[PDB]
Ligand SMILES: Nc1nc2c(ncn2[C@@H]2O[C@H](COP(=O)(O)OP(=O)(O)OP(=O)(O)O)[C@@H](O)[C@H]2O)c(=O)[nH]1
């Protein structure tokens with residue numbers, strides 16, 4: 120049995136009770152607790168739980184201000200001694216190290232808190248600067264270098280070597296000829312996967328916690344997430360344009376096929392975002408109705424597009440299962456996450472009351488942390504695919520809608536659909552070809 | 568038993584998510600988990616008839632505009648929601664109705680107009696206003712306060728009745 | 734999918750973190766920032782089976798024996814690391830092996846012996862020596878290089894294989 124300081128000289132000594140901490144029914148899992156009780160477990164001396172640090176530092180802002188967090192972890196660091204060598208070894212040391220762990224993490228991965236509040240940084244520097252002791256010296260100097268590093272301002276090693284860039288009708292350096300059919304479907308998929316993979320990897324938790332991407336300053340707080348969704352929406356729309364603007368049935372059939380091949384390579388690359396960009400295009404109002412066009416799509420392809428569409432069926436039942444099984448790298452579909460985060464935050468109380476005592480509902484924050492954590496896990500692994508500057512540039516600059524407002528363009532596309540394949544009983548007219556090059560696909564097998 | 572596929576459309580910020588949650592969820596449990604299997608399904612009795620409500624709420628994915636048509640098509644009935652303190656969302660109601668009518672390829676699609684109270688801000692869309700819009704479309708109008716649970720069941724059940732009587 | 738809790742132990746500076754980060758993001762951390770206790774996660778398919786790795790990277794030789802015991806209670810498998818260019822580090826290995834054995838109270842706790850930094854020429858520990866010590870515990874020995882990436886996957890996945898067959 121180890122004695123703790125007097126709860127009168129050290130607030131974090133109060134014994135646990137149903138009135139300040141609740142546990143979920145293998146270390147303990149905190150359902151709810153008081154800010155004090157939380158920070159006590161945040162730096163508990165009995166066991167280790169880095170997950171708690173990430174969780175807490177990702178979501179604390181909803182129940183505790185930055186300035187206050189600091190003041191509290193500082194109080195936690197300054198522990199009064201009442202065996203003394205036992206208490207130091209089993210209580211003060213672990214705790215104090217863990218408080219320094221929280222400071223290190225806070226400054227390293229949530230630095231924006233200090234960027235937006237200069238006095239917080241000042242206090243942090245001052246605090247770190249007051250940590251005396253040869254022991255803590257190691258860490259103190261580290262947190263310091265990290266802070267300075269962060270104030271003034273990533274290589275990749277691969278198992279194997281990236282495959283060879285594939286070309287078709289368009290040749291290196293002739294960006295003016297680049298188009299859906301003249302580029303190699305394999306590279307199209309490849310380049311778009313990298314692009315989309317970077318876009319995904321760039322999204323930070325701060326753009327997600329608090330449903331901020333859905334609020335009015337979403338443009339200021341969730342720039343990367345928005346930039347990502349918008350690329351996806353454009354790509355989908357481009358696919359739709361390409362299809363309804365190719366009026367000749369024989370050429371149009373050629374286009375949809377190519378797109379389905381691209382989808383196939385996406386599947387291969389685990390770029391589920393791309394998969395859905397395609398599925399969504401095919402299911403759009405303009406495309407969905409082109410019966411004469413899908414009529415002529417080979418059966419192997421129709422099967423590919425159907426299996427892809429089944430992923431989203433029954434609330435992404437199969438999609439979720441497949442991501443849980445594949446082997447990264449992969450580009451997940453962000454949409455799913457956005458909905459669960461939002462719904463988790465709206466369907467759960469910010470606090471639970473026990474005997475008139477509002478305890479922060481931590482299980483709510485833990486749940487949202489699980490989601491952001493899941494996102495981050497898939498963000499680590501980089502694709503081993505060589506970039507093609509020009510092709511890259513090509514898709515980065517695609518602008519399907521031009522200067523048209525969404526609705527106008529949207530109606531345009533649908534009308535286009537009605538023109539190239541009129542509602543029955545109206546008769547199916549014939550249209551002149553538009554591509555002056557061969558429409559045969561180079562297939563999706565990489566040349567070696 | 569019959570299964571109805573209900574879709575909840577509308578501009579973001581109007582509480583669409585509080586509606587679905589307030590319907591499905593157990594209101595006497597501390598924690599609620601959306602990621603949990605079939606937390607979107609619920610068996611209910613409507614006018615003595617038992618059926619299964621399968622609800623599609625894509626709250627938070629509003630920005631993914633190109634996926635609208637896909638999500639909407641999976642539905643038999645639609646809940647067009649707008650916040651009563653947000654005029655823009657109200658005005659968006661029309662386009663949503665047109666978009667639904669398009670993918671479903673019908674001028675007669677089961678749907679309900681829902682005015683939702685999200686908070687205590689000043690109301691900006693007057694009951695009568697929605698009333699009149701709902702009538703011009705020839706569809707029912709229900710006002711709700713998803714947070715105080717008022718109106719939610721009415722909103723959903725009314726729609727099921729629409730589907731049945733279609 | 735099965736979950737495997739792996740723990741990386743060994744004297745400071747040897748490469749524990751560098752190894753994990755390489756495994757995790759395929760990035761080599763050149764600078765040296767002492768680790769207190771961090772936690773990583775990785776979904777990877779090993780031998781056609783999808784796992785989820787929880788890698789607990791610990792702080793080494795910092796003389797905090799009190800805490801080290803806490804890390805080893807949870808771990809299922811351990812990656813004991815020493816640098817082939819630091820004899821002391823090699824000499825410490827038994828201390829860790831003994832401690833794990835003590836804490837978990839078992840003579841066959843899954844684990845691998847890793848001689849990191851094999852991209853450096855100034856080797857001071859010979860593969861034979863390490864190989865023997867490995868055989869004495871009845872565990873495999875892998876020479877790795879967080880810098881070039883050499884043998885990293887093998888190190889970790891092998892450990893998975895042993896927790897898997899235990
Ligand atoms: N050239 C080379 N340098 C390495 C290798 N592994 C680690 N290093 C270098 O050694 C230093 C310390 O590596 P870390 O991985 O932080 O050591 P550690 O075991 O985590 O240290 P603690 O967490 O303090 O116990 C770093 O500056 C790395 O760049 C390796 O395989 N090759």
Ligand SMILES: [Mg+2]
Nearest residue numbers: 749750767768
């Ligand atoms: Mg380290």
